[PDB]
Structures are given as structure tokens and as C-alpha cells.
């Protein structure tokens, strides 16, 4: 995997490749790693496919039950539920998750949860095996309060390089835009992003 989430002026955008690996064989070349846990709270999944799916399903359940009683949960709340699962079961889990959401009060927020189950609130986050190759690029190119079009280009160029160098990353670049306007899905194919 290569995954990232980036906050910007109007909200937050999540980004991911579509590769699932069993050894050197690509088990799925069109995987969806961007996952809904609530209307406008999504997550990027990396590590074990089984572990991250099981966690995401449990979080979705918790937030659905939260909403029935107390109304819409904050992005911080969603990240906390993820953390609780990842931290308490750290010995049995291989899950690197980035949580991203849009509030109207708090606007776009990004929380990254690495292997240990620690929580880190950041302006943007990168994770997965392919992220290693773009720490330099992302640090030099990220700006706060970018536009939608700029942020899309930033994620597109970043994951393009991650895919180029990481054998464990590839396929299409999926993205999910989270704003006041709603939820928009984007897809970008090899023929476009490879020749960037």
C-alpha cells in the first residue's frame, strides 16, 4: 500500500492506490482502500487487509450506534474508537490507518494511527510501504489552505511517485473528497498519472 489524507481550504481529501498483495502476486489490482465509517468520516487502510476490514466494520458499527443516541460524532471521536481497537489489540493486529473527516465547526481534520495504536493529529498524513519514497516530496510540496484542484494535484503527483518506486503499490489512484458540498469520488488511471 500507498495511502494519504490531506486537509485543505474547503475540507479534506483522502487518497490511495488499488493494489493488494499476496507475496509478489497481485491478488487484487482494483482494490478500494478508502472506506466509509460515517457519512463524512472516512479512513485509509494499510497493512493486513483482514485486520483493517474487521476494524473498520467495528468502528462503523460503533459510530452508527453513537449517531442513534447522541447525533453526529466528531472526527476526533472516530479516531479515538480506531485507536482503542488498535492499541488494546496491538499484539494481534497489523493495521496502519489514517482517519479523515469533515465537520462544519472543525472543517477538515486528519488523524494517523500507526502500528502501535498511537494517535497523531496532522495537517496531512502519509502511510503504507510506498509512503517511504515520498517523505521528501510531500514535505517540500505541501502547503496549508490549498484549493481543491491544488490538493488533488498534490495527492496525484505524490501517489504517482510512490507507485513508481514501490512494487507493493500500483493500479489506479482512488480519491475521496470531503467538503460541506458532500462526498465526491475520484479515480485516475495509469495512462494519466504514470507520465506525470
Amino acid at each position: 500500500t500507498s495511502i494519504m489524507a490531506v486537509t485543505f481550504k474547503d475540507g479534506v481529501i483522502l487518497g490511495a492506490d488499488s493494489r493488494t498483495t499476496t507475496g509478489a502476486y497481485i491478488a487484487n489490482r482494483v482494490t478500494d482502500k478508502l472506506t466509509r465509517v460515517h457519512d463524512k468520516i472516512w479512513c485509509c487502510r494499510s497493512g493486513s487487509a483482514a485486520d483493517t476490514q474487521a476494524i473498520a466494520d467495528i468502528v462503523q458499527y460503533h459510530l452508527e450506534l453513537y449517531t442513534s443516541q447522541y447525533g453526529t460524532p466528531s472526527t476526533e471521536t472516530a479516531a479515538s474508537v480506531f485507536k482503542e481497537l488498535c492499541y488494546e489489540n496491538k499484539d494481534n493486529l497489523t493495521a496502519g490507518i489514517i482517519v479523515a473527516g469533515y465537520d462544519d465547526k472543525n472543517k477538515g481534520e486528519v488523524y494517523t494511527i500507526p502500528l502501535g495504536g498511537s494517535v497523531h493529529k496532522l495537517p496531512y498524513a502519509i502511510a503504507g510501504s510506498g509512503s517511504t519514497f515520498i517523505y521528501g516530496y510531500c514535505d517540500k510540496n505541501f502547503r496549508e489552505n490549498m484549493s481543491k484542484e491544488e490538493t488533488v494535484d498534490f495527492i496525484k503527483h505524490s501517489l504517482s511517485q510512490a507507485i513508481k518506486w514501490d512494487g507493493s503499490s500500483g493500479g489506479v489512484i482512488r480519491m475521496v473528497v470531503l467538503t460541506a458540498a458532500g462526498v465526491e469520488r475520484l479515480i485516475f488511471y495509469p495512462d494519466e498519472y504514470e507520465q506525470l
Binding site: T1, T20, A50
Partner: peptide
């Protein structure tokens, strides 16, 4: 097992 499947990895991401």
C-alpha cells in the same frame, strides 16, 4: 495473507 493479503496485504495493502
Amino acid at each position: 495473507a493479503p496485504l495493502x
